[PDB]
Amino acid sequence: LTVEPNLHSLITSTTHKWIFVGGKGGVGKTTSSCSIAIQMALSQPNKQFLLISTDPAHNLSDAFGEKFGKDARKVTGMNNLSCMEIDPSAALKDMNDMAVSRANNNSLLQGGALADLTGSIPGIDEALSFMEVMKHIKRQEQDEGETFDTVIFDTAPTGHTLRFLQLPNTLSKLLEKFGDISGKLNELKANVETIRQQFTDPDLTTFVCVCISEFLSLYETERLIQELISYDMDVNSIIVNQLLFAENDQEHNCKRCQARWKMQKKYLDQIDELYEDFHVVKMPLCAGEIRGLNNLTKFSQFLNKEYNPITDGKVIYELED
Amino acid sequence: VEPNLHSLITSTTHKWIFVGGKGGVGKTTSSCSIAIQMALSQPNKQFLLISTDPAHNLSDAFGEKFGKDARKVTGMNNLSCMEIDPSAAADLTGSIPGIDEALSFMEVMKHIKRQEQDEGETFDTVIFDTAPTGHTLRFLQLPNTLSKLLEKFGEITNKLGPMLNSFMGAGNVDISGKLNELKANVETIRQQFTDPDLTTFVCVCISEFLSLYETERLIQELISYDMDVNSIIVNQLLFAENDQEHNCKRCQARWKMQKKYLDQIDELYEDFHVVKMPLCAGEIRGLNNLTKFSQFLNKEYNPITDGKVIYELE
Ligand SMILES: [Zn+2]
């Protein structure tokens, strides 16, 4: 049985609690995050969703045209979707800094410095950064009194934000050789392993990759998928953005564009043969800046029901202009 | 710094010019253009354009059929092409980095010299149309890679026991001697490929995030090899603002994006010769067209005045 080229079963899932969305390059990652968030929220009115970002550029705020911050806020126009933009690294520095100060005048796992081993042991910084994020969330849940059913992580445009899933095994290997700090490491290792318990369960968390139909994007996506596999995180979906089905479009005249399409077609076919088992969802190029709830929802719709270049053209051109 | 390759195309000191760029960035076209440009401006000298890509990109580019044996490009007096497959034409390979590369390269250098000894005519300069994959020239590190190894053995072997050491019979010493001979071979080439006036690498890329990222990586790798990197050609630029405004908001949209990175490129690689090359919808194929296009590597293209020239190719 063919694997539907859409995210319908995910957007419809009542089992997933953590959905990570990423893609390097200018591939429409942010708008994909918002679209998945909206689509999930509209399809499950009964539940509450959190869309979190780490990008210091406040991509979410300029995506929706609202102002989000460290405090969750419901997207204006929706009942069950909220956004929060934070900076884990910054808050970590502030917290670590004060801990260093308390040391000189004497996440509890910081007394003094466990952060110095950062530039030595891979994934400790990331684990600490992530724990910061998980903290800001729970604190928001405890105050507002309402817990989020599902969280969409608009992954950070750089680094390897979730390399910490390797931390546990990276430590055991180290702790054996080496056999204060030692106690903080074991406490950290226990924290990352309870998370892996969650993040490693296919029914609980998954990662959807975002990319454009180009050689470098395809290879970057391959790289990303291998990495996610090496973390035991589920990867079953790939969103391919900016596709211009020039093959038959309104005002479709431009030969340069036709040339581009021919190129995209080339790789779209490689992607389909390479990731047959994946949900490979094709999304139309939408010249402009899909911004604001309305347009984002109109466009996000194609994540659930595959886009038809023939039939649905009218819909995207109501946005592209 | 001038936004062209005029000084290189005009150099009478360079003997080896490598051209590379990953992705569909017009690497091959660039290789041919540089070869032609060099050949046309130095009729007095003989040039060799060699490729490794099994697809026979050179033959498809010129519309001629090249192979293991050098052949003059039809219509030119001092430019010849040679398409080889080094790999096609000793298992420490999957263990020590750069050994296979060095072996592959030496193969290439051998098919060349044997072509020079037969034809009786030596090539003054060679342009290497680098392979679209792997790390073809990581062997420049092999020498230091080996010294380190043939040293860790001395710190271990000379720090073991008469029995233990001697208790390892098998044709390995049959290697200690060949590794030292190969190390000597890569180091004589390194003396050549490491001299700025003798060899250089021109990068090719498109003005997009992923391509800039990739060429950034390429440059770092080349510097770690002590190979000179001073030029970067940026292909497929559609100067849509000057495009007689042939309309298409999608293309104008693309251009604004290319403009954004063209800017970053300028600021990041200021000391480099950053040559902007116009998008040329089609497949610049055949000597004539390649020549017409290649000219903009020497004298910077002008979207306003030169437009007519590239559209007589569309
Ligand atoms: Zn166009």
Domains in chain B (CATH in brackets) are 1-314 (3.40.50.300)
Q: Residue B56 and residue B67: Cα distance in Å, rounded?
A: 8
Helix-helix angle A181-199:A167-177, to 10 degrees: 150
The rounded distance, in Å, linking the Cα atoms of B257 and B136 is 32
Catalytic, B118? Answer no
Pick from A25, A254, A288: CB nearest B209? A25
Residues of B in contact with A257 (CB under 8 A): 248, 250-251
Residue A29 is assigned to a ligand binding site:
yes
Q: Which residue from B37, B11, B72, B3 is spatially nearest to B291, judged by alpha carbons?
A: B37
Secondary structure letter of residue A202 according to DSSP: T
Cα-based torsion angle of the residue sequence B130, B219, A124, A36 in order, rounded to the nearest 10 degrees: -70
Looking at CA atoms only, how far is residue A254 from chain B in angstroms? 6
The residues after which chain B has a C–N gap greater than 2.5 Å are 89
Sequence-ordered list of residues with C-beta below 8 angstroms from that of B145, at least 6 positions apart, any chain: B96, B97, B98
Contact A24, B210 (CB under 8 A): yes
CB crowding A272-311: b at 16 or more within 10 Å, else e = eebbeebbbbbbbbbbeebebbebbbbbbbbbbeebebee
Q: Quick one: closest CA in A to B254, which residue? A: A287
Distance from Cα B155 to the centre of ligand 1, integer Å = 65
Q: Give A71's contacts (C-beta < 8 A, 6+ positions apart).
A: A84, A140
The two structure tokens encoding residue A152:
């969409």
Q: Are strands A150-154 and A49-53 parallel, antiparallel or unpaired?
A: parallel
Spatial strand order of the sheet with B229-237 comes to B71-72, B79-83, B47-51, B125-129, B16-20, B199-206, B229-237, B273-278
Residues forming beta bridges with residue A235, ordered by sequence position: A207
Please list the residues that pair with A279 across neighbouring strands.
Answer: A237
Q: Could you give the maximum distance between any two Cα atoms of chain A, in Å?
A: 73
Distance in angstroms (rounded) separating the CA atoms of residues A190 and A307: 44
d(CA B240, CA A3): 40
- Length of chain B (residues): 314
Question: What kind of experiment solved this structure?
Answer: X-ray
- A67 touches A84 (CB < 8 A): no
Give the B window 257-286 contacts with A, CB below 8 Å. 257, 279, 281-282
B245 CA to middle of ligand 1, Å? 11
Cβ within 8 Å, pair B251-A256: yes
| Cβ neighbours of residue A178 closer than 8 Å, sequence gap 6 or more | none
**Enzyme catalytic residues of A:** 55
Tell me how many degrees the CA angle A314-A316-A320 measures, rounded to the nearest 5. 115
Q: Identify whether the C-beta of residue A52 lies closer than 8 Å to the C-beta of residue A73.
A: no
Q: How far are the Cα atoms of B99, B202, B223, B275 from residue B267, in angstroms, in the given order?
A: 37, 18, 19, 14
Residue A140: half-sphere exposure toward Cβ, Cα within 13 Å: 22
Give the residue ranges of DSSP H helices in chain A. Answer: 8-11, 29-43, 59-64, 88-103, 124-143, 167-177, 181-199, 215-229, 255-274, 293-304, 313-316
DSSP strand pairing (B47-51 vs B125-129): parallel
Distance CA B8, CA B10 (A): 5
* DSSP per position, A125-136: HHHHHHHHHHHH
